[PDB]
Ligand binder design. Structure first.
Ligand SMILES: CC(C)Oc1cccc(-c2coc3ccc(-c4cnn(C)c4)nc23)c1
Length: 337
């Protein structure tokens, strides 16, 4: 179905001419287009699959962005600007300001190399500021990950790095925006305990204990570690394995959370029911280690990032650092000069 209406040269809604595909996902496609009714201005158009769950999510995203873009019309808090929406051969299409690559895509195109620490500090500060603005207006995003953080401009300079015997790209401007508001949920709406595909998922979500704003803080911690290492610390698609990986990196889960969960399959007595000496178990031991052993330097700026990450990755959501507190953390002192 979609392949028939998203090709270079096709014209959407009698005005948007498709140039090329920027990226794909489970939801559909994002394409760059020329807007022939706004003087040729280039824009990004998200074309949503004609499938009920994604159509519903798209309708929800439209409502959320209307509210956020009117509350913050100059994008002071760095939520992407929605320009319009329309329907095209049974597909919902949402038009946005054109941004650069996602942070994930940049990492991938640079050979899975990490961002350097001064860029991480700026990006982290903007992400915390943006999502805190959501938290101040009774929203939780629920789906934060590097694919959903995008550079305003993704241009780079390029040089041979003698230390690693490989060519390396350096972002010119690290400014970002947050996208994808199709899972975003208000305090006063129903919170599905069930949630779909992701490894930025908080332990209270996996154990079905209820969730709200703190689950976003957990996700942001996972993102910051990825930016620092160039790869995910939870490379898994199985819930039980994921919990085993958490235990190895952060220590054992709090007893009171193990006691409250109705997900009894994961536990024997009050311990994670995980065979350490299986095929999968030996892989977890070999790929994961305590958090601080991932540090690449002992320099104080690195220690500061790791202290903030540790507090974001607190198991109990009632004890987890909030984003208001995280914006005052010493890791960010260097930005207030
Ligand atoms: C798969 C997707 C991230 O691929 C790219 C890859 C490169 C650029 C863009 C991109 C450029 O300007 C944009 C404005 C909005 C969005 C958007 C809105 N919702 N979602 C899920 C993305 N995406 C862009 C997207």
């Amino acid at each position: 179905s979609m392949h028939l209406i998203c090709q270079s040269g096709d014209v959407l809604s009698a005005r948007y001419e498709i140039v090329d595909t920027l990226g794909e996902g489970a939801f559909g496609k994002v394409v760059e287009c020329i807007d022939h009714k706004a003087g040729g201005r280039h824009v990004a158009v998200k074309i949503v699959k004609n499938v009920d769950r994604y159509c519903e999510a798209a309708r929800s995203e439209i409502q959320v962005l209307e509210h956020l873009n009117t509350t913050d019309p100059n994008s002071t808090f760095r939520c992407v600007q929605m320009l319009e929406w329309f329907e095209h051969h049974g597909h919902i299409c949402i038009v946005f300001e054109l941004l650069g690559l996602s942070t994930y895509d940049f990492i991938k195109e640079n050979g899975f190399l990490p961002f350097r620490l001064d860029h991480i500090r700026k990006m982290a500060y903007q992400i915390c500021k943006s999502v805190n603005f959501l938290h101040s207006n009774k929203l939780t995003h629920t789906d934060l990950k590097p694919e959903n953080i995008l550079f305003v401009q993704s241009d780079y300079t390029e040089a041979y790095n003698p230390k690693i015997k490989r060519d390396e790209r350096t972002l010119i401007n690290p400014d970002i925006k947050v996208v994808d508001f199709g899972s975003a949920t208000y305090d006063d709406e129903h919170h599905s305990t069930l949630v779909s595909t992701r490894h930025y998922r908080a332990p209270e979500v996996i154990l079905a204990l209820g969730w709200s704003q703190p689950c976003d803080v957990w996700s942001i911690g996972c993102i910051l570690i990825e930016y620092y290492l160039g790869f995910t610390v939870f490379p898994t698609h199985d819930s039980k394995e994921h919990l085993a990986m958490m235990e190895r990196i952060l220590g054992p889960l709090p007893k009171h959370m193990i006691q409250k969960t109705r997900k009894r399959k994961y536990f024997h007595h009050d311990r994670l029911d995980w065979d350490e000496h299986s095929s999968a178990g030996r892989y977890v031991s070999r790929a994961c280690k305590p958090l601080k052993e991932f540090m690449l330097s002992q320099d104080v700026e690195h220690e500061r990032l790791f202290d903030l990450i540790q507090k974001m990755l607190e198991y109990d959501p009632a004890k987890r650092i909030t984003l208001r507190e995280a914006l005052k953390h010493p890791f960010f002192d260097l930005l207030k000069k």
